[PDB]
């Protein structure tokens, strides 16, 4: 692979985009999406410390 | 949510949080190769111990509703904790979900290709022989359309993982593969491996004993052995053994045309830029094709590329094995009482010359040939090899054997260098030097025979210092890459003072291609197509200083097709018609302008007469073009707006990064952007496998075209 | 690096950077990163300045490729693309024409609209620090700074991105693609080089103290600082020091060639002393079989119950009568262990459940059986063992699986070679030996995993097929295993071998030195005259094995391959001298005999199958009697054989220290009977080679 | 010829990551004074260097690992975790 | 031919010298990089 971002910075964005796409066009419960993104923001606050 | 949950419960432990934070994506491959590295305990024995155990195979959980627990004989094949007995495989193999997945032979074509080669692969007799190794350089991949590894793995990423394609956002196989195997994916990683094995070339050095094509090498275990040989023709052939030949022919013709050009370098480069070879561009092919030929090396040198130490002479490429050299200019007298200054190669030297159909190993002293081992296919081929060898030998013996005036000329009527003059003289009649060289006794050892002046092999007698090898001389193609120093006349030097190559030795085979060299129909259509292509600049260049537009030397190939007698009358007629159109504004039709323009290139003569038809001689026969309406030579449809020149058609009349991830223009997107193409929209998208970058539309191309040549308008003012 | 740089750029920028690099002696072969940086700089300036014209009024516009129709002022004057002197000249010209103070530091581009001095810098590090450094070096002057990086960011002075948005985004994208391209090419090396402001430096590798102190101690005894030695190496003179060193060296240091005639080879010195006994893992010729002739389909036939129905086929077990002791150690413990063997064999019918594997009780005699150089002369029996290995038998011992159709060119030849070899080799006794070793070692290994704590009873079972074409199961004896806690592959596991036989040790007592012999019963024995009823013996020995010792023995079938190829080798070279290869003329010509024997003081040449089985048995004994002494002897005897062979072709060979080679060979002849048999064979070969 | 060989060697030392240090047989870990597989001893050395003030190999180029090796021999104390 | 115990006779300091001559007029940092191993073998310890 090729990329200057950290592993976590790429993984979080990929998870968020995948959640968006399989929520809108695909089929997933909004609560599962919300928990995905709350854990993602938890990591966002965690990778800063 | 499983993946992100693993991320969360992994980022709490500190010594892993730090390493997930610091190390970047570019380096995952350098961190993927950090293993315990111990599970190498006799894989056959551990495999046998596990197979002897009950249910060693591990599968997924969907077999519970797919295969039964007990078979037709009460055999156990399941577990719980998910282990599986191997007999379960054989059950599902017998009567299960039969599917039409027989679509298979499109992704695995690289193997059925070999199967079909074996089907009609007619065999032959086994003439056993002491097979001797020929160190050749061959390719090991069949039928791959000659694609390099980088652009091929880019096509891989494009066809198998579009949502994470590479960042180069500036190709027909991509369409074919994405179309035919769209919804019938098998195993993405294995598909990628199969296509990288099918499409990527690889040429390296192998010892062969007669195999040239790719099909002749992939079956080398049948053809070649220690002391045997089998004539086997695999009833077929591939593209990658007759594609590089097209580039070779293109380079030969381009150099042969540029040698006549006033500026050979610029003309040759402008041709190489404006040339297409099987749906592709010449510059990228030359940048990525590892084909070795004089003209190809000249084209590579024209763009400053490293190539071999090729001491090319008479079409034979030389490679130095050992020995140094010193220039030491010297005067010499010929066999016809003629002074010649020459660069006497002093010192001890060792060379290996590889030719088209013959090769040799030479050990040579100052103007004295010590040893020479030659092998070719035809009698005359080894004769030519020995002729060029004796010419390079520079001995006084061959100097004495010169008979007649030495005036051999280039196609541009130029003095050839003395060495090439000697070679070109000897190539037609060389029977003077043979009987004047010298004969010696040999011992007829180890399949090394001698040759006689009358084209006769001999056992114990040979020419002075000569050896003919049986079953081929070992070739060595040493890899060396150094920068070149091209001049304006297509003679390349190695920057230290050696003239490497020159066009004086290029042409031997006018291959029939499996800018006026094609038929005159192509001259006509190409003139009209070039007019239509850059039509917008011609429209104002026809109004402003049209004397320079006419004398554009791009019309010279067509200006020479109109008969040389009535050229000026046509020119004056069309120019006065153009001036009449310039005076009376608004009363002009572009159709007649394109119909009659390229004739204005001629020096006009004020003919007190007019015309209604103009003639062109193609293949002898004359074809006309009218002055009003359509003609078979100029047929322009009124509604279609397409121009028909002898039936043949002739013209008609990614994104960019704005910065890093920016939370303004919505959330991040995947790489599928056709619904935000409304009139133009900015959006941040994750490109490749890295971070997110903004993206907008495009307004320019930024190609390798004349935009690179605009520098000459602000540099060298 | 260099080829890629020459790939992704037009030859004009390449030529410009190449000329601009000859300016300060900065060789481009070393400063390749500076090459890439300068090419990037020039292409950035060009794509920055392109397509920007000045309208008839005071504003800038965009245009197509080019059309200098009455308007040529490019809105930008290029500076870096020119030479130093010409750059300064144009800068002074435009400064005097506009009235702007010329900068003391050389700028790279000039703007006309804002009438500002735009200088652009391409960096790899954080753009913030690069902008701060460019500002601290060039400050207090009206000079606009514009800094780009490959990551996509951009930093201008006071947010004054003095260009169009898309025309600049094109440069951002080109830089970003160049970044990615040199990333997947593994060419992100220039991260540590352009990270200095001065974008030219290459990685300099320091050698400081506490390390140079080792560098200073590594030089020859003439210097103290290694820099002195490096400067001494820099200047070297090929003056001909070799000739002086030669005249200085003693004349006794020389490679004196000793001639090699048929009189020089002396027969090999042989050890003398006690006769060499047998150290082979199991008995080869003396052990006899216990047939059951059962077509059990080899369906993983449980190897223990096969042995009990072997025992069900023999009657006449005499009272165990110890015959030959070990000459050292507790001999009766072996017969006590044998009584325990028979008891635990017949104590299965008292168990409510049959175990498939009998775990012997931890008896003290069995504990002792499991343990919980001298110059030995050659003996007379190893030749006889090998002879009986070369003899033909009644059985087949091979399941050679099928092979595909016979297409024409060589597969016909390959067939008529391999099937001939198989037919001449199938019924050989060495094949039985190979299969025997395979079965014993396989059962031992497969037991050594699950029986990691307890003693298991493993029958020495083989299988074959007599000429009547009926499957037969044979029993050679039993083996008691110790504990098999195999952590490593060198971990030792002890074992006790109890093998049936009909050969009395009282004939050759020295051979069974590691053996205790028990007269174990009497069997019906057929001979040339009816029945004889010869006594049945039990040979017991104590030994050890390991995982590698078993796996070299579970791969014994190579002895066929190693045979065939070393036969096939002979069928290639000697047959390479042929237009149509001599392949069938190798066989089917009984007049061609091969020398293999010398009984009556004369060469006794035999037929071809004798040679095939002889080479097979050679490989078999090399595998089973595998010893590093045999390895060394083969390696050192190959040389003398090659010298003799070169003399046979009369090529006047020679040596330097033949006595040294004799010393090296005699150093590896101590106690192995196989090595000594090969040595006597070689001596007899030199005797019959007109030498 | 030595100069062309040196040019190829320079290209190698420029492109070489630390993965070309894992392709090999068993190695010797000095951390445990014992023979260990390649990647295991490599990771041990990396972690014991990261415990101290030696973090140059984070760039990924083997030359930075060699720079770390050079700086390591100069320190007085060596605390192993 | 063969060279008996030749591998134990190749001295690391001689390798340092031959490398230093092979690295003639090359940049000093490269000579310093390649000179590491022969110096380590000049002062090397053998584990028993």
Swiss-Prot record, chain B:
GO terms for molecular function: RNA binding; RNA-directed RNA polymerase activity. Pfam families: Flu_PB2_1st, Flu_PB2_2nd, Flu_PB2_3rd, Flu_PB2_4th, Flu_PB2_5th, Flu_PB2_6th, Flu_PB2_7th. Its main location: virion. It comes from the Viruses. A motif (Nuclear localization signal) lies at residues 697-700. The record marks 605 as: Mammalian adaptation. It is found in: Virion; Host nucleus; Host mitochondrion. InterPro entries: Flu_PB2_2nd (IPR049110), Flu_PB2_6th (IPR049114), Flu_PB2_C (IPR049115), Flu_PB2_CAP-bd (IPR048298), Flu_PB2_middle (IPR049111), Flu_PB2_N (IPR049106), INV_PB2 (IPR001591), PB2_helical (IPR049113). The keyword Oxidoreductase does not apply. GO terms for biological process: 7-methylguanosine mRNA capping; cap snatching; DNA-templated transcription; symbiont-mediated suppression of host cytoplasmic pattern recognition receptor signaling pathway via inhibition of MAVS activity; symbiont-mediated suppression of host gene expression; symbiont-mediated suppression of host mRNA transcription via inhibition of RNA polymerase II activity; viral RNA genome replication. Belongs to the influenza viruses PB2 family. Plays an essential role in transcription initiation and cap-stealing mechanism, in which cellular capped pre-mRNAs are used to generate primers for viral transcription. Recognizes and binds the 7-methylguanosine-containing cap of the target pre-RNA which is subsequently cleaved after 10-13 nucleotides by the viral protein PA. Plays a role in the initiation of the viral genome replication and modulates the activity of the ribonucleoprotein (RNP) complex. Influenza RNA polymerase is composed of three subunits: PB1, PB2 and PA. Interacts (via N-terminus) with PB1 (via C-terminus). Interacts with nucleoprotein NP (via N-terminus). Interacts (via N-terminus) with host MAVS (via N-terminus); this interaction inhibits host innate immune response. This is Polymerase basic protein 2. The gene is PB2.
Swiss-Prot record, chain C:
One of its GO terms (cellular component) is host cell cytoplasm. Mn(2+) 2 binds at residues 80, 108. GO terms for molecular function: endonuclease activity; metal ion binding; RNA binding. One of its GO terms (biological process) is viral translational frameshifting. Mn(2+) 1 binds at residues 41, 108, 119-120. Its cofactor is Mn(2+). Disulfide bonds: none annotated. A motif (Nuclear localization signal 2 (NLS2)) lies at residues 184-247. A motif (Nuclear localization signal 1 (NLS1)) lies at residues 124-139. It is found in: Host cytoplasm; Host nucleus. It is an enzyme of class 3 (hydrolase). Keywords: Cap snatching, Endonuclease, Eukaryotic host gene expression shutoff by virus, Eukaryotic host transcription shutoff by virus, Host cytoplasm, Host gene expression shutoff by virus, Host nucleus, Host-virus interaction, Hydrolase, Inhibition of host RNA polymerase II by virus, Manganese, Metal-binding, Nuclease, Phosphoprotein. Phosphorylated on serines and threonines by host kinases, including human casein kinase II. Binds 2 manganese ions per subunit. Its main location: host cell. It holds the Pfam family Flu_PA. InterPro entries: INFV_PA, PA/PA-X, PA/PA-X_sf. Its EC number is 3.1.-.-. Belongs to the influenza viruses PA family. Influenza RNA polymerase is composed of three subunits: PB1, PB2 and PA. Interacts (via C-terminus) with PB1 (via N-terminus). Plays an essential role in viral RNA transcription and replication by forming the heterotrimeric polymerase complex together with PB1 and PB2 subunits. The complex transcribes viral mRNAs by using a unique mechanism called cap-snatching. It consists in the hijacking and cleavage of host capped pre-mRNAs. These short capped RNAs are then used as primers for viral mRNAs. The PB2 subunit is responsible for the binding of the 5' cap of cellular pre-mRNAs which are subsequently cleaved after 10-13 nucleotides by the PA subunit that carries the endonuclease activity. This is Polymerase acidic protein. It comes from Influenza A virus (strain A/Northern Territory/60/1968 H3N2). The gene is PA.
Curated annotation (Swiss-Prot), chain D:
Phosphorylated by host PRKCA. RNA-dependent RNA polymerase which is responsible for replication and transcription of virus RNA segments. The transcription of viral mRNAs occurs by a unique mechanism called cap-snatching. 5' methylated caps of cellular mRNAs are cleaved after 10-13 nucleotides by PA. In turn, these short capped RNAs are used as primers by PB1 for transcription of viral mRNAs. During virus replication, PB1 initiates RNA synthesis and copy vRNA into complementary RNA (cRNA) which in turn serves as a template for the production of more vRNAs. This is RNA-directed RNA polymerase catalytic subunit. Influenza RNA polymerase is composed of three subunits: PB1, PB2 and PA. Interacts (via N-terminus) with PA (via C-terminus). Interacts (via C-terminus) with PB2 (via N-terminus); this interaction is essential for transcription initiation. It is found in: Host nucleus; Host cytoplasm. Belongs to the influenza viruses polymerase PB1 family. The chain holds residues 102 to 182 of 757 of the full protein. It comes from Influenza A virus (strain A/Northern Territory/60/1968 H3N2) (Influenza A virus (strain NT60)).
